[PDB]
Design a protein around this ligand. Structure first.
Ligand SMILES: Nc1ncnc2c1ncn2[C@@H]1O[C@H](COP(=O)(O)OP(=O)(O)OP(=O)(O)O)[C@@H](O)[C@H]1O
Ligand SMILES: Nc1ncnc2c1ncn2[C@@H]1O[C@H](COP(=O)(O)OP(=O)(O)O)[C@@H](O)[C@H]1O
Ligand SMILES: Nc1ncnc2c1ncn2[C@@H]1O[C@H](COP(=O)(O)OP(=O)(O)O)[C@@H](O)[C@H]1O
Ligand SMILES: [Mg+2]
Ligand SMILES: [Mg+2]
Ligand SMILES: [Mg+2]
Lengths: 173, 460, 512, 458
């Protein structure tokens, strides 16, 4: 897993994209690179011991979607360090650094049944106060919980479900 | 043209990267200009793509990253043949005696495969060394291997000097001396002794001195073996002297540690017994020629059990054990007659005469060892009239095994002696059978042949 | 999966332009600082062993040249350093002041004066790391270097150009013997060098004070790497000392170098290796710790007169040079099998074994003769000492063979009891007080007294007073014979007759 | 201005802006909840990260806390104001009295005095202990070390040396408790306070309850006060309660600092971490420090790397052994291993030296006979080896002594034996003038007259 070795590359790519006000182009470029990493044949080549400046060039060849200077340079650095497989995580941490920079968040709302669209309005209004960030919502439905709602925002959760109330009563006794 | 570049230098270990077509094979030799001076690297491993890890055969200091490296497309190969007699060479076959270019006609790679079991011939021609005790107690055939075991200061190196001199002067045989991990003082002593004794023009010398990287000290044994094999293929009977196996094994331990291999029984490389078998199995008597070998082997801390001497034993055909106690009493060669042994000491090969004489001597000394402590506690005047005779004859036998060497003349000024096997058996049999009960003990000390004991007694 | 100095802004620089211009292969920037090792980024033209120059006036030695890093060790206090500092590669290797003017000075491993007596008067600089003279440039060692100890000079001779290991457990006289070997040269024509690795400074101050009391300090160089100095300055100190001894060797003079506890240079080098992440060997020592000591000790050589003429460009003709080494090793619980002793016992030409049982039992210097060896042997002795030591060797060998019965000695026959009580007396004869070195005339006189049976009737308790009385007697009545032996070492029927007469008349007329 | 990014046991990793990264040994600070935690940085890793050791309980630290960079090393009160008061490793007062009125504060990381400034002294120091100042006399301004296993006497001996040297000495004194029992620290503090000598002693305590950073730096905190008193021109006593804990605390943290293990799991920098401390505890031309150090040896193994590297840094080494304590012979000093740089004919005179070497020779000769006695019994000794053995046992007894600080154990009153009065007794026992007395006449007595007087009662 590359959660840790991806942090420096995502941070460098984001700090560069900001200087040039191209964050969106960089995100799409990384999203394409992290896809070419997943192809059946390319994932074979990435594992075999090729010399870095050969693997990097064969990888560059498969992408005209990369602005020839700054995206290809990132590919060449990651290739020199032997980390092209880390791109699918560079993408996630780039999206994270962006969401932080623009003060945005994305809340999952899980319920036994879909909400009335006034509840959703008040939920978003409330969370945009719990968090400084402008919040999207993704409503989701799960009939294990049977009343109330779960609000999950990052690693924080608010366990408003009655299922939670029951399991939390059982353990008082 | 030069097609590689250095990418790491960590001590003696250098990494070089080539385009993935031109990757050198293992054991290939590379070359680079370390300043105004050339340096050659031996490939040890092909790892990853294009990169190759090597051991420098020389001073690693002064290497930059990114130097151009040129790959010779052959292993380290050395000059061979008659041109090398009387010269000194390092592991790369360059002269280090300042007499200039070698004059080679042919070069051989030092890495080659051992003779098949199909090509060997068993032979039982006993070498005659001219040393009383080694000839009597530890006979060895052509194509055999002999190990001189002992601590420090017992006489391995001068015993090998004397064997070289005797074989070169009495039998005019060619010899090769591989100074694995040589002490430069001893190498200079050896050179001057061989030129003074006038044998140098029948010995070719290879020196990997101690002050050199591990790879030199490891591959010098193979350079010497390659010269010996070139002489063998001419149909000769060469004799190969390895000045210490123990330093061959330490050089292997160093090399293995540098490459980062996982260590084994007492810090020894994992490949110990395979390096030893690669060395020792090229020394054999083929149908075309023969390589005999004498090998000094230091036993550290007297234990005989740590992996180095423990693994050498599997290959030797005879063992001569030297003790410092015997040496301190002043009876050089200092060979212990009761612990030294040979696989060839049986009547079918040495004949009942020699076998009987050797077992007789061992029996007399083994009985004297019994009697020593009765002599200590009860005094000698209490011994039987037969036991006092056994004591006198054991003491005379014990004196008569000592001998003055031609190369020890620098130590004591006494002139050296060469003693045939016939005179050895005749003398020891005469002693054991009472023919000399009338001579004093000291008439046998450092005497040489038995007639010289009667010539000496008159002077006493 | 762990990073290798791929860090945010260095990566961003490459994003901006991957093929960065070749702005300067001459310089780089510190990226790490810890335990005296710094990692340098850049320095494309660094060479292994090269001196790198830091802010202030400080240097580092480039030891690891890797893919995008140089690992270098700071030769001094490192805590001042900080990430991001700029650094330059000098084209140089480490050099040290060298010359005759160092005699009588105390200097640290960089040759800076540390005794406070003012600036050095060196004759130029010499590289610390140098190759030893080849096989063809040596000459056989056949000149004695006198320690003044009856135990050593008779039975374990040291010759000019030898390398004699002193090895033993803690507190057994390893330093006392080595420093008596230096004091005795006060008027011998041999320059001395004493390099102290990892010792506490107030011990060096004390041995320098003893060298100053006796006449020895004006003839010796002291090189100090105290316990608080960084590992690099302890690991390089022996090479700094050898480079100063080679100044004399290469010019037709004789020198003697005493490396104090090389077993503490091996530990400094182990620290440096383990901090640079190098593969640990046995006891965690690095792989090339044999190659560390081997290329140090192979510099102690005797060089023939032709090498000296070629070196000094004709200025000195017909003189051999020499450098003698006396490395010291410490063995924990008598274990000579450990990784460091088992290498240095294999490199050297001899071994002096100091044993704590003899040291406690009163035998000082506590040399063990049945296990010590000198491979040069009689070639390094004056012929009188060579003649007279032959009987001491066997007198002690037979005693070692009979020793077991010492605890049953009442039972023994008188024929062996004489051997046993002669061995005890010659063993009592080799004891000697500290800082009392004997000239060859006195050693030969006492060993003659012992060999020819004159101690056959002296009681074991009185051997020391016998020896002292004999030397005092001889110093007044027969001063000319001593002055002859000391000057020539010869041994003739005449010398033997005169010695026989001295012993007869002394044992007749004097008392002890 | 920095963030925590890892917390592994006692070591904390902090991330700073690239231009603000602290220097090595600078001290940081964190608000560990309702607490203030001081971190001392050990390494500058790359990229603005820095690796630190916590001077306090590491529990409760979250990631992402905010740490403040104090731009100076740890600094302790020092000088006359710190006298008679107990202090933390951080120099904070630990007794319930008020603030320390110090005028000046010193950083605890310092360079050793130059080789030029050192001084050497032959002036012998006298103690009430027979065996110590016979076999291993030590001198004013020099180092002493007591080596022993667990529970053999190296604290009782140090309290006796305190009693015999420190009350009868005019200058100030410093006692550093490094990783030993807090019970003993309280006992010592109250003994001093109840005998009204506390106003001449400065106490630093970093006992075994505390986390590794405190045990790691408390010894330097004590050396800094001893060094201040030294440089003022005074002459000082420095007692260290167990210096082994100072390297053990380094071994506990080493692997977390990411360093490869050495011979027996010890840090690779053992000898340097030990030398950098012991090279600054020395006397100099401007003033002198006399120091006694207890040195624990693990598993009674005197060849373990830590005692083995410590031996070289001491002038007089006193080695205590369990096989002697189990005989009830206290102090359990092993006279065939105790030694001193001062034992020379030039320093202690010929009579003292000659008696010491005679004692060693007899006791070693007795050691050589212990196997034949074990197998064949004592009746097989020659008529004079029995005499050697009897005198050796009498000497073994006579080296025992009662201590004023051991009355709590044996009830017997302490004895103070002058040197003149002990070399005479040992000359007597060796020369044979006391063969008539039984062995037990010598056990636990002072001068020799007490032995001849004790024989009358059996
Ligand atoms: N020939 C001698 N006669 C009497 N005493 C001696 C003799 N040689 C040394 N000693 C004493 O032995 C003690 C230890 O000697 P020394 O310090 O030389 O040993 P060492 O091996 O260097 O110890 P360390 O390992 O601590 O350096 C010294 O105090 C010295 O006085
Ligand atoms: N036969 C001999 N005659 C005289 N001296 C000898 C003899 N054999 C050995 N020696 C002495 O032993 C010393 C070392 O012997 P050497 O063979 O070098 O020992 P090692 O086997 O350890 O190399 C030499 O200096 C020499 O003086
Ligand atoms: N002089 C002495 N007299 C009597 N008993 C003693 C003496 N010295 C030590 N002991 C005993 O040894 C025990 C060990 O205590 P201590 O000296 O504190 O060991 P440690 O050195 O580990 O602290 C003491 O509690 C006491 O029982
Ligand atoms: Mg040899
Ligand atoms: Mg010493
Ligand atoms: Mg205690």
């Amino acid at each position: 897993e590359f959660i840790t070795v991806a942090r420096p590359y995502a941070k460098a790519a984001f700090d560069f994209a900001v200087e040039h006000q191209s964050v969106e182009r960089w995100q799409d470029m990384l999203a394409f690179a992290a896809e070419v990493t997943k192809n059946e044949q390319m994932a074979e080549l990435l594992s075999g011991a090729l010399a870095p400046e050969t693997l990097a060039e064969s990888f560059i060849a498969v992408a005209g979607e990369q602005l020839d200077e700054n995206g290809q340079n990132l590919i060449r650095v990651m290739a020199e360090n032997g980390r092209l497989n880390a791109l699918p995580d560079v993408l996630e941490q780039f999206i994270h650094l962006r969401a932080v920079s623009e003060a945005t968040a994305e809340v999952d709302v899980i319920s036994a049944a879909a909400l009335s669209e006034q509840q959703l309005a008040k939920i978003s209004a409330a969370m945009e106060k719990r968090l400084s960030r402008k919040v999207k919502l993704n409503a989701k439905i799960d009939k294990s919980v049977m009343a109330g709602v779960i609000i999950r925002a990052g690693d924080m959760v608010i366990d408003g479900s009655v299922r939670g109330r029951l399991e939390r009563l059982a353990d008082v006794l | 043209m030069a097609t590689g570049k250095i990418v790491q230098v960590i001590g003696a270990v250098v990494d070089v990267e080539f385009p993935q077509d031109a990757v050198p094979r293992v054991y290939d030799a590379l070359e680079v200009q370390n300043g105004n001076e050339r340096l050659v690297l031996e490939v040890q491993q092909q790892l990853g793509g294009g990169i190759v890890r090597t051991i420098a055969m020389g001073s690693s200091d002064g290497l930059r990253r990114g130097l151009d490296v040129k790959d010779l497309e052959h292993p380290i190969e050395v000059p061979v043949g008659k041109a090398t007699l009387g010269r000194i060479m390092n592991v790369l076959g360059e002269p280090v005696d300042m007499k200039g270019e070698i004059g080679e006609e042919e070069r051989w790679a030092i890495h080659r495969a051992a003779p098949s079991y199909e090509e060997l011939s068993n032979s039982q021609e006993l070498l005659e060394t001219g040393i009383k005790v080694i000839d009597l107690m530890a006979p060895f055939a052509k194509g055999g291997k002999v190990g001189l075991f002992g601590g420090a200061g017992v006489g391995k190196t001068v015993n090998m000097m004397e064997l070289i001199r005797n074989i070169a002067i009495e039998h005019s045989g060619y010899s090769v001396f591989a100074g694995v991990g040589e002490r430069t003082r001893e190498g200079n002593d050896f050179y001057h002794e061989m030129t003074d004794s006038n044998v140098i023009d029948k010995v070719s010398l290879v020196y990997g001195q101690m002050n050199e990287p591990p790879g030199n000290r490891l591959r010098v044994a193979l350079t010497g073996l390659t010269m010996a094999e070139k002489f063998r293929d001419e149909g000769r009977d060469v004799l190969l002297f390895v000045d210490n196996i123990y330093r061959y094994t330490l050089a292997g331990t160093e090399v293995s540690a540098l490459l980062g291999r996982m260590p084994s029984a007492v810090g020894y490389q994992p490949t110990l017994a395979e390096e030893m078998g690669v060395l020792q199995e090229r020394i054999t008597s083929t149908k075309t020629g023969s390589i005999t070998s004498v090998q000094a082997v230091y036993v550290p801390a007297d234990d005989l059990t740590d992996p180095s001497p423990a693994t050498t034993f599997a290959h030797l055909d005879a063992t001569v054990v030297l003790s410092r106690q015997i040496a301190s009493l002043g009876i050089y060669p200092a060979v212990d007659p009761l612990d030294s042994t040979s696989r060839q000491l049986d009547p079918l090969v040495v004949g009942q005469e020699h076998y009987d004489t050797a077992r007789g001597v061992q029996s007399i000394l083994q009985r004297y060892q019994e009697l020593k402590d009765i002599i200590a506690i009860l005094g000698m005047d209490e011994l039987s009239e037969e036991d006092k005779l056994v004591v006198a004859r054991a003491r005379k036998i014990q004196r008569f095994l000592s001998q003055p060497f031609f190369v020890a003349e620098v130590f004591t000024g006494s002139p050296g002696k060469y003693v045939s096997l016939k005179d050895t058996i005749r003398g020891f049999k005469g002693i054991m059978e009472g023919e000399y009960d009338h001579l004093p003990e000291q008439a046998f000390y450092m005497v040489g042949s038995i007639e010289e004991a009667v010539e000496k007694a008159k002077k006493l | 999966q762990l990073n290798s100095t791929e860090i945010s802004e260095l990566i961003k620089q490459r994003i901006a332009q991957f093929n960065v211009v070749s702005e300067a292969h001459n310089e780089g920037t510190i990226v790490s600082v810890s335990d005296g090792v710094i990692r340098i980024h850049g320095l494309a033209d660094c060479m292994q062993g090269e001196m790198i120059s830091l802010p202030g006036n400080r240097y580092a030695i480039a030891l690891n040249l890797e893919r995008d890093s140089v690992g270098a060790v700071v030769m001094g206090p490192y805590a001042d350093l900080a990430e991001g500092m700029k650094v330059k590669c000098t084209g140089r290797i480490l050099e040290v002041p060298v010359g005759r003017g160092l005699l009588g000075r105390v200097v640290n491993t960089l040759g800076a004066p540390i005794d406070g007596k003012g600036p050095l008067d060196h004759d130029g600089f010499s590289a610390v790391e140098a190759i030893a003279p080849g096989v063809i440039e040596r000459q056989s060692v056949d000149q004695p270097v006198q320690t003044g100890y009856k135990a050593v000079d008779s039975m374990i001779p040291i010759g000019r150009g030898q390398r004699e290991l002193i090895i033993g457990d803690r507190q057994t006289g390893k330093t006392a013997l080595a420093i008596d070997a230096i004091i005795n040269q006060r008027d011998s024509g041999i320059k001395c060098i004493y390099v102290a690795i990892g010792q506490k400074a107030s011990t060096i101050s004390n041995v320098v004070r003893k060298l100053e009391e006796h006449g020895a300090l004006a003839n010796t160089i002291v090189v100090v790497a105290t316990a608080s100095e960084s590992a690099a300055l302890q690991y390089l100190a022996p090479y700094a000392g050898c480079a100063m001894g080679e100044y004399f060797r290469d010019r037709g003079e004789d020198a003697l170098i005493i490396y104090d506890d090389l077993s503490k240079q091996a530990v400094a080098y182990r620290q440096i290796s383990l901090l640079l992440r190098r593969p640990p060997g046995r006891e965690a020592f690095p792989g090339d710790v044999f190659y560390l000591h081997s290329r140090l000790l192979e510099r102690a050589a005797r060089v023939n007169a032709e090498y000296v003429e070629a070196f000094t460009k004709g200025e000195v003709k017909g003189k051999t040079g020499s450098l003698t080494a006396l490395p010291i090793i410490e063995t924990q619980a008598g274990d000579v099998s450990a990784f460091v002793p088992t290498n240095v016992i294999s490199i050297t030409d001899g071994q002096i074994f100091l044993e704590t049982n003899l040291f406690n039992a009163g035998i000082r210097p506590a040399v063990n003769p049945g296990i010590s060896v000198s491979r040069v042997g009689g070639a390094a002795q004056t012929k009188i000492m060579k003649k007279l030591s032959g009987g001491i060797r066997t007198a002690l060998a037979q005693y070692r063979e009979l020793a077991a019965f010492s605890q049953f000695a009442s039972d023994l026959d008188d024929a062996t009891r004489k051997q046993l009580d002669h061995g005890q007396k010659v063993t009592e004869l080799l004891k000697q007080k500290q800082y009392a070195p004997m000239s060859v005339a006195q050693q030969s006189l006492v060993l003659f007294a012992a060999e020819r049976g004159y101690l056959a009737d002296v009681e074991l308790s009185k051997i020391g007073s016998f020896e002292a009385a004999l030397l005092a007697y001889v110093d007044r009545d027969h001063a000319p014979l001593m002055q002859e032996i000391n000057q020539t070492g010869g041994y003739n029927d005449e010398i033997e007759g005169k010695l026989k007469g001295i012993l007869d008349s002394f044992k007749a007329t004097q008392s002890w």
